[PDB]
Subunit: 367 residues, 2 copies
């Protein structure tokens, strides 16, 4: 999205729209994210219903209502502790070869005359890698993409009421069916004596929730490097690491997130009542000129680059080192295999939270 928020960011960085509060500046976006005690993520009934989950009174419910993402400490910390080591530097270092190979195998199926980079590269790569990490097999590639979209859409509407549909029911059945093929962190979850619903929620968060966002990081990067004609400079000056960070800043896969106030609290010059929703715009914060000099310019070797695209504070994205690594390898291999990219057509994901491409059609030259 174009940076609409400059003036808001300047003159109304904390704004009540008649329904909720919206936050546009970096200072107050970061402040909200880090102050978990005043700005709660308990938006989906998890703390409220924890007793009835554990004692079994709730049998049929939405698993993604009960994950670490919509919990506060101590609950949040108890849950996240269980998978804190899942993407450790040592684990990712050994995985690099598999990610590079998967990437190359995906590039092998691209038709240079015309092909959809979303379909051929950006969608399959995260799905294949996370399946490998968790030891949960991809039986039906189609269903995995459907699950990835569905879950991402749902996470984007916390507290909103959606009955389980046919597809989500199939996802649940898959997870139930494949528990014991999982690697260590899946085992920890199954052996934990968390409620069944929580176990489902937790596994689905790890297996599925990171796919659509990482897919969009990859597409957004291809878009940005092409738009600003940066491929040769990225190759020549080895800017892959910093260029992915600039893509994250400039085109965040997650545009915004939301909190609910636990008490009356002051934010900037505004007083926000207890129980109010506070929507925080990562996309706008990332262009804040008081933090990012020439913030409307795409600078592939920008540094420092303290963007908020993975959040900030206790919910800082658990997947961040994996998503960074996947996107860097995807771009490296893409930049190595092809030259002279020309974009033929694009189509945006129709979503206000999820920022990415449904279609990215390109023409390429080999070598």
């Amino acid at each position: 999205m174009y940076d609409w928020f400059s003036e808001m960011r300047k003159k109304d960085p904390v704004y009540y729209d008649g329904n909720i509060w919206q936050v546009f500046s970096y200072r107050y976006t970061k402040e909200v994210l880090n102050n978990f005690s005043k700005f709660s993520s308990d938006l989906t009934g998890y703390h409220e219903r924890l007793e009835d989950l554990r004692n079994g009174k709730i049998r049929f419910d939405i698993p993604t209502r009960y994950t670490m993402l919509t919990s506060d400490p101590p609950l949040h910390d108890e849950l996240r502790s269980m998978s804190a080591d899942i993407f450790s530097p040592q684990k990712l270092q050994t995985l690099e070869t598999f990610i590079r190979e998967t990437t190359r195998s995906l590039l092998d199926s691209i038709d240079p005359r015309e092909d959809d980079i979303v379909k051929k590269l950006a969608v399959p790569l995260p799905i294949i890698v996370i399946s490998k990490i968790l030891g949960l097999p991809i039986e039906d590639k189609e269903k995995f993409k459907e699950w990835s979209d569905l879950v991402a859409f749902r996470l984007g509407k916390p507290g909103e009421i959606f009955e389980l549909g046919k597809k989500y029911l199939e996802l649940i059945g898959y997870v139930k069916d494949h528990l014991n093929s999982g690697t260590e962190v899946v085992s920890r979850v199954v052996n934990s004596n968390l409620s069944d619903i929580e176990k489902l929620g937790y596994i689905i968060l790890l297996l599925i929730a990171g796919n659509e966002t990482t897919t969009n990081l990859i597409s957004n990067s291809v878009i940005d490097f092409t738009r600003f004609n940066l491929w040769q400079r990225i190759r020549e000056e080895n800017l892959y690491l910093k260029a992915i960070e600039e893509a994250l800043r400039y085109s965040p896969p997650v545009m915004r997130t939301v909190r609910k106030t636990k008490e009356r609290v002051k934010l900037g010059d505004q007083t926000i009542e207890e129980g109010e929703y506070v929507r925080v715009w990562i996309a706008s914060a990332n262009r804040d000129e008081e933090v990012f000099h020439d913030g409307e310019k795409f600078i592939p070797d920008r540094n420092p680059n303290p963007h908020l695209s993975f959040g900030s504070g206790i919910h800082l994205c658990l997947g961040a080192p994996l998503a960074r690594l996947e996107a860097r390898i995807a771009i490296e291999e893409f930049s190595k295999r092809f030259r002279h990219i020309e974009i033929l057509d694009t189509e945006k994901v129709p979503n206000e939270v999820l920022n990415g491409y449904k279609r990215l059609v390109v023409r390429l030259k080999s070598n």
Copy 2:
């Protein structure tokens, strides 16, 4: 969409993608559009089936397969000549007050603190105006919106999709129910020598086909004038006419259209065989530096501005004077009524042909 085509437009303006031909430059796009005898619009078998339509041997089919849009001379001219005067300068001048009064009532619905101008202004205005012109009542507002979307979607996929569907069926039922209650051009069509299927197609085309495109012009205009900070200047210098022309050039509601070759033809250095599909990118043509100097700049008083957004040649949009008038009055009244627009959120229509906004959320100050 960002001008991706810049590359193609200069190095590969006529490109075979393995499946169809795609044209990106102004010169060849306009050449294709104007050469109907070589580049046919007959993509739905209208000419092949004309005899069996007119003698009653075809009684079931998709009505929108049989309109002037997908026909060549002489059929095209027979059809268009029946409604050539429907939007005459004299008829539109008598409609100005109704359009203005309608617009003001719509502007009344906008909550300055936050509102979606797509929902409040851009979507309803064309529907209300064309219903008035044709004397066909808007009995269900939501249904007319659904029909405007599905018909627009179908027209963007000429010759594909051979199934009807429940919403389309309700549209057909609606038209059949009102065949004899409309104004003169509706009566002209209904009492003509055309087949029943054609009459249905013709009425659908006039009543419904113009809504989504005109809506997008209004939205794209609001976007562009805001993005480039042009509202004050458009007011002061009275630039409404040329500014709307520049919105059309820069942000065409119809991105592209399609033709089929009737014979082997040369286009540029390329040789196109008979029976080939030729996709013509209005959006790229409109940025051609050889025709529009500083073509990537939005210049609200650009003149000349020979954009192709309403097409070129015998299919040159019949509704152009109406769409232009509605957009002008919408923008005029909006600019008089409000100040200090700030955009809070946008969402694009997920379509490769239709260029517009599903949501355009803004905050405003009154008078």
